[PDB]
Structure formats: structure tokens, C-alpha cells
Amino acid sequence: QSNMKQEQMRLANQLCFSAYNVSRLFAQFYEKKLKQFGITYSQYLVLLTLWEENPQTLNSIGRHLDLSSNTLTPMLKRLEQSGWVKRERQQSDKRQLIITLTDNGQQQQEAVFEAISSCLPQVFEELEQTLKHLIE
């Protein structure tokens, strides 16, 4: 048991430190490649889900990105100020706030995808559940 236990801890450290390094490299990569569009990574995530489902209520975006309304509201206005999306609230029923891509916001999807796709040269959900438990 002792020899196998020591080796499992070594493999745990090895894998988790690799991912630890990747967290730093990803942050630099996205900052460098998204600069040309004037958007942050979280803004890019908003555009990411809008390009899959458009339009979307802010509550729908928060459910996709696991982000609160207090987090989305500032940057949703930043994407509207930069011309990516439009904001208009319903006057009945759920009273929700609808986010809709502009014409320019929709066209630029391929250019954004191309700038990011190089992250790879030409399972995760189980770790996300376990890691979240360890942190909280």
C-alpha cells in the first residue's frame, strides 16, 4: 500500500501542477489574442453563448456561464458600448432582460474563433465536480 500510495500522490502532484501552469498560460494567451477585439475573457464567454443561442435573456446567459447578474450587468453594458450586443427588457410575463447580438457582433464570430483556435495543435465535468467540493 505504501509504495502505491506514494506513487498515486506523485501522479496527483504531477497532473495538478501541469494544470496549474496551464491556468497561467491560458490567461496570458486569451489576453494576447483577444486584445485585437477589445474584449476580456468573460466578455468573450458572453459572446460564446450568444453565438450558440441568440437572443438570450441575461438570466439565460448567467445560467450558461454560472455568473450572477451583478457580474453580467457591468460587462453587458460594456459589450453594448463597444457595439457587440443590444439591451431591451420585456414589459410583461417574466419581465426579463433580452440580450441580442448586433449585426457586427454576429459577423465577427469567425474572426474571434480563428484567433483563439490555435490553442491546440492541428472527463472534465467529473473533475469540475470534485474540485469544486475541495475548494468549498
Please identify which residue in the block is written with the cell numbers 474571434: 112
**Whole-number minimum distance, CB 44 to Cl ion, in Å?**
29
Asked if 6 is part of the footprint of its own copies (rule: CB under 8 A), the reply reads yes
Does position 28 bind Cu ion by CB under 5 A? Answer: no
Q: Which one of 3, 18, 91, 92 is in contact with its own copies (CB under 8 A)?
A: 18
Exposure string over 33-57, b if 16+ CB within 10 A, otherwise e: bbeebebeeebbbbbbbbbeeeebe
* DSSP type of residue 82: T
Q: How far is the CB of 5 from Cl ion (least distance, A)?
A: 8
Least distance to its own copies, CB of residue 39, Å? 14
Q: Which window, 28-36, 53-61, 67-75, 84-92, contacts its own copies (CB under 8 A)?
A: 28-36
Among its own copies, Cu ion, Cl ion, none, residue 111 binds (CB under 5-8 Å by kind)? none
Give the list of residues 6+ apart from residue 42 with CB closer than 8 angstroms, or none: 65, 67, 71, 75
Binding region for Cl ion (CB under 5 A): 3
